[PDB]
């Protein structure tokens, strides 16, 4: 869709521009995390990605998993 | 024969009862620590077992308490 919009740069029709706008809106929604891109139909598999959320802390002494006291 | 305090004669043996070869196996014991992760149900079960004549888990628990608790 976006390639066809790029090719029709000399004069774009209403429907082509509307479809391109819908596509870019969907892409922005995907980027913001408001919608999932989906998985390939052949097998359920989502693309790998880096850790969006990460926290750091020192080892938790005195936790309830100690069971030493 | 040596006469008992109750008046029943018996034979006196100088060797300890624990020195027997068959009893040597049970003499060596591993001192388990049941005070790790104490639960009220667990303590109640230990006391109930000690009531019937177990006397082992209660002894280990008492040993753990006498060393873990400073005030006691």
Curated annotation (Swiss-Prot), chain A:
Region ranges (Disordered): 31-69
Does the keyword DNA damage belong to this entry?
no
Q: Give the CC-aspect GO terms.
A: host cell cytoplasm
The UniProt disruption phenotype note reads: Accumulation of unattached tails and full heads.
- Where does it localize? Host cytoplasm
Entry's induction text:
Expressed in the late phase of the viral replicative cycle. Expression of late genes is activated by the viral late transcription activator C.
Q: Which UniProt keywords apply?
A: Host cytoplasm, Late protein
Question: What is the recorded name of this protein?
Answer: Gene product J
| Organism name | Escherichia phage Mu (Bacteriophage Mu)
Q: State the taxonomy lineage.
A: Viruses, Duplodnaviria, Heunggongvirae, Uroviricota, Caudoviricetes
Q: Which residues of the full protein are shown?
A: 72 to 140 of 141
From Swiss-Prot, chain B:
- Annotated localization: Virion; Host cytoplasm
Coiled-coil residue spans: none
Modified how: Cleavage by the viral I protease yields a C-terminally cleaved portal protein competent for DNA packaging and procpasid maturation.
What triggers production of this protein?
Answer: Expressed in the late phase of the viral replicative cycle. Expression of late genes is activated by the viral late transcription activator C.
In which domain of life is the source organism classified?
Viruses
- What role is this protein assigned? Forms the portal vertex of the capsid. This portal plays critical roles in head assembly, genome packaging, neck/tail attachment, and genome ejection. The portal protein multimerizes as a single ring-shaped homododecamer arranged around a central channel. Binds to the terminase subunits to form the packaging machine. Acts as a linker between the capsid and tail. Required for attachment of the neck proteins to the capsid.
Q: How does it assemble?
A: Homododecamer. Part of the immature prohead complex. Might interact with viral I protease; this interaction gives rise to an early 25S initiator complex. The scaffolding protein Z and the capsid protein T should then be added to this initiator complex to yield the immature prohead. Host GroEL and GroES are also essential for the correct assembly of viral head and tail.
Q: What is this protein called?
A: Portal protein
């Amino acid at each position: 869709v976006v390639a066809w919009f790029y090719l029709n740069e000399s004069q774009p029709t209403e429907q082509i521009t509307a479809t391109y706008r819908d596509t870019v809106r969907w892409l922005e929604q995907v980027r913001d995390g408001k919608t999932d891109p989906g998985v390939e139909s052949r097998t359920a598999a989502s693309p790998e990605g880096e850790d969006l959320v990460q926290v750091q802390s020192d080892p938790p002494v005195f936790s309830r998993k100690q069971k030493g006291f | 024969r040596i006469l008992d305090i109750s008046g029943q004669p018996f034979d006196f043996d100088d060797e300890m009862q624990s020195r027997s070869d068959e009893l040597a196996m049970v003499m060596k014991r591993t001192q388990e620590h049941p005070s790790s992760g104490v639960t009220p149900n667990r303590a109640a079960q230990m006391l109930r077992d000690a009531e019937r004549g177990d006397l082992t888990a209660q002894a280990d628990l008492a040993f753990d308490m006498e060393e873990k608790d400073t005030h006691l």
